[PDB]
Design a binder for this molecule. Structure first.
Ligand SMILES: O=C(NCCC(c1ccccc1)c1ccccc1)n1cccc1
Ligand SMILES: O=C(NCCC(c1ccccc1)c1ccccc1)n1cccc1
Lengths: 534, 534
């Protein structure tokens, strides 16, 4: 009965195999067949390559020793190109992910080297992306043992804490499968991926080939780097941070969390960006002062500028959703020198109407009735804090799962009045994800978050100062077909204010854009970032 | 009686003045005198420039309006160059810093614009470096008022919470000084810096001109972004983070803190690097598990790799001092693909002697006697934890302030036996800086830090696996003339292991390199980083 899956790297999790380049070179340079591949293995267990793979010497030390073996054109150049060309075998990783998702312990067991080349980062990035999807990574150069030595196999089993018969082992080198087979492990010789995966699904009884497109990698809160900046005496801001490159500040909506970006954080970091996923003021681990004035856009934006000041960041690209999207447009209007680029999901840019009170403007739209219900301090807090699991389960649902009516909320005297006490779990979320939001809202409740709605006049007066301005920095507006509150048509006039505005549109997408359509959100954001945010 | 100092930006804190470029252009292009400067002021308070300076419109909106005024060659090009050329007037900032150091409230009061140019970052960086040295920054485009309007002056006084006679105001525009003068503020017309500073020191009674070279900017712990990464179930690592660019991981020595890099953090961030100043395992806010094995180099290095993994960093340049320097050489030897570049202060790279026990090797050097005293669990903890203020005051001193004998520590039965109970405060540190170390060591004590010395055999066996390797990634060795334990001569053989090793040497420098010689440390590190670490 299988419970562990082991994969080789070269020719298995990463393709094309670096081993099959010596032969490729021979053919291209019309060299005697197997000349380079023979130099590579010269001396066998006593040879330079075994010393390299055991970690006795580094790759830069091995390069000249290989050159001496070849003289039975550059070895460095051949290997630099082979390593650069080698990329993740996505269907193999998909299978490993599905196996781990089903309860399997997974490991990469690889014959590798200590890379000290000037271009070592490329491989470092590859190992990083790959390894975080596995329980263990066993490298020959770190353990001082190599496949096919039987000791590395006993080391693998001790690491897995599993009997050989519980382990499936995948490798492209037949000689490296033999010791695992001899111990009683299920083995798979990997030539083409499809066949290897058919063999894998046959032995495990788990569908691995032709399966639906998986969701992007999410975040485990306990595995993130958590950051804290005090922006003023009584206010600290919490954020989750991942990746390197240009800073990308993610701003959630109401009533959310940094975790609402769980599907974007790993994808944007992988894309070459330094992601800072905020807990906005009033939320999660960030401070939640009680005063209403603490949540007007002018103060919220000033604190986000201080946040950048304290971190030593001259700029960040600002990406917001819902109330976070509203904040990012004001960041672009009032602090363009600090905003590298601005993007909003669902939230359109609507200039203040100087000839109408914001209270009047909100009364004009029937979908915005819930906002008037939110005005009186304590009323909405009571209903939203009564049962947290019910609040999040009722709120976080796809366009076709609605249990809420946001019309005549005041008249009915509640957001959840003719809504169930025990809502069914939406297909967008797990019970554990709901419980994360529940645990977060137990710290400060809904006062700070609802205070974001209690500054209409204050925000209106501040916004009026920007009525003569235009947004001329790079900007992206992403609309969601099925958001019935922040409707796509509400954004129709944006290019009058943002002439160079770029757009994205997500069909069959509700309000909770990031979790409703994670793959498409990531595709739109990464594409825009690489073209407009450097 | 003065207690507040106010400075203009253009032509005062930043030079050359952007205003004096329209005239420079006229002369270079042989245009009728004052043509461009007249277009710039066209319409006066009703004109395009006043609207710009009040924040009604952005710089990119103003550009074409200026062009229409000029037609009574590119306005954008002229302004892009003028802004890029404008740099901090270092002696003016030095004076503002000395005034604030003496108890003065300081502010920048400036007529500026909302910059949305493609090249806005240059100015954003300048404002960032400047503003953090002042109590307030008042910008015309944010406050909706401009100098010389009297309202901005009343706004300045309300912001300062000071009567006009308590305020000195420095400006290069005579018309802008008049309202401050009329209110009873001491005013200084700034033409050349030296004269302005003579006037400033005359009115304040504080020496501001010809004063000694100040120390680099330090860190206020409460104003830093603090980060936390869980590397394994019972171990979390704390770090302080500042800046953007390539990641630079700072590793302190024994018995130190992230704060030991206080003079380097702002300088390296300013130099264009993303600084991660660690609290090493066993210290400050990082976890301090009690087991000795938790502090062997193999585990310490593995956790630093996990730290990078969790933050999404494929590499970091590793800079260490003392025990941190020892760790960085092992990082370079065992994980070169994760080390962009390696630098050590004081700590040489000494390969393990495979023909001699590390206990024997330590017994050979009389200066290393304190290390044998540190072996027995509980003995050194008791002495170092007895009085924390005494420990740090006795330890942290310059080469000429020694109160400690590190010879025959065992024979004398203590590190501080013939040392004072109340040491005098060293000239390298303030009482407040000592108290920061005191408060940090109250959390975990000296067990975890001393455990770094309790893995000699374990570290020796691991180091022996690297005896066939060479360090071939970029490397820097910095020696301190007067470190009497980590002597410069101990590093003499390093190029046998690190052929491409670069060096730095600090004369009249004791063991506590970062605080003994901050300016020279920063100069050596920044120079090496820009040339070798990208
Ligand atoms: O009220 C705002 N967003 C919350 C909408 C949300 C919601 C409404 C009411 C309570 C909680 C959350 C919603 C949920 C489902 C569908 C559409 C919209 N905004 C006001 C300005 C910018 C955003
Ligand atoms: O013991 C080590 N460093 C501490 C030296 C320090 C010190 C010694 C004893 C106690 C605390 C701190 C010192 C202080 C003053 C002068 C020179 C050196 N190392 C061992 C391997 C790498 C460093």
């Amino acid at each position: 009965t299988l419970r562990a899956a082991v994969f080789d790297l070269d020719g298995v999790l990463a393709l094309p195999a670096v081993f099959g380049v010596l032969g490729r070179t021979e053919e291209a340079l019309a060299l005697p067949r197997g000349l380079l591949n023979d130099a590579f293995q010269k001396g066998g267990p006593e040879g330079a390559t075994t010393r390299l793979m055991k970690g006795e010497i580094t790759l830069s030390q091995w390069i000249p020793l290989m050159e001496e073996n070849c003289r039975k054109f550059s070895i460095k150049e051949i290997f630099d190109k082979a390593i650069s060309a080698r990329k993740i075998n996505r269907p193999m990783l998909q299978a490993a992910l599905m196996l781990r998702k089903k309860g399997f312990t997974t490991a990469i067991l690889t014959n590798t080297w200590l890379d000290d080349r000037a271009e070592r980062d490329g491989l470092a990035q590859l190992m990083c992306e790959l390894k975080m999807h596995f329980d263990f990574l066993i490298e020959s150069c770190q353990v001082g043992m190599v496949k096919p030595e039987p000791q590395i196999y006993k080391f693998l089993l001790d690491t897995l804490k599993a009997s050989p018969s519980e382990v499936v082992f995948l490798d492209d080198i037949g000689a490296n499968l033999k010791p695992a087979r001899d111990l009683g492990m299920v083995t798979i010789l990997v030539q083409d991926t499809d066949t290897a995966l058919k063999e894998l699904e046959k032995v495990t009884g788990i569908q691995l080939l032709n399966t639906p497109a998986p969701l992007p990698t999410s975040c485990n809160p306990s595995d993130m780097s958590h950051g804290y900046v005090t922006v003023k005496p009584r206010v600290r801001l919490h954020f989750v941070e991942l990746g390197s490159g240009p800073a990308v500040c993610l701003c959630h909506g109401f009533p959310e969390s940094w975790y609402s970006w769980r599907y974007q954080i790993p994808a944007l970091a992988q894309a070459g960006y330094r992601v800072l996923a905020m807990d906005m003021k009033g939320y999660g681990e960030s401070s939640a002062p009680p005063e209403i004035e603490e949540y007007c856009m002018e103060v919220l934006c000033k604190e986000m500028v201080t946040f950048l000041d304290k971190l030593g960041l001259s700029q960040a690209v600002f990406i917001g959703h819902d109330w976070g999207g509203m904040l990012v447009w004001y960041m672009a209007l009032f602090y363009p020198e600090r905003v590298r680029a601005v993007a909003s999901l669902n939230t359109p840019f609507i200039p203040a109407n100087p000839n109408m009170s914001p209270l009047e403007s909100i009364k004009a739209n029937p979908v915005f009735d819930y906002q008037l219900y939110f005005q009186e301090p304590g009323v909405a807090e009571a209903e939203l804090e009564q049962n947290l699991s019910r609040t999040f389960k009722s709120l976080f649902r796809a366009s076709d799962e609605s249990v809420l009516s946001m019309h005549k909320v005041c008249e009915a005297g509640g957001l959840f009045v003719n809504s169930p006490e025990e809502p069914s779990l939406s297909r967008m979320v797990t019970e554990e994800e709901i419980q994360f939001y529940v645990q977060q809202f137990k710290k400060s409740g809904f006062r700070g978050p609802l205070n974001w709605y209690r500054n209409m006049e204050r925000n209106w007066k501040w916004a009026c100062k920007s009525l003569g301005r235009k947004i001329l920095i790079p900007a992206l507006m992403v609309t969601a077909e099925k958001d019935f509150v922040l409707v796509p048509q509400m954004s129709q006039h944006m290019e009058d204010w943002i002439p160079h505005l770029k757009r994205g549109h997500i069909e069959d997408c509700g309000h909770w854009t990031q979790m409703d359509k994670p793959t498409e959100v990531n595709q739109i954001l990464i594409k825009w970032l690489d073209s407009d945010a450097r």
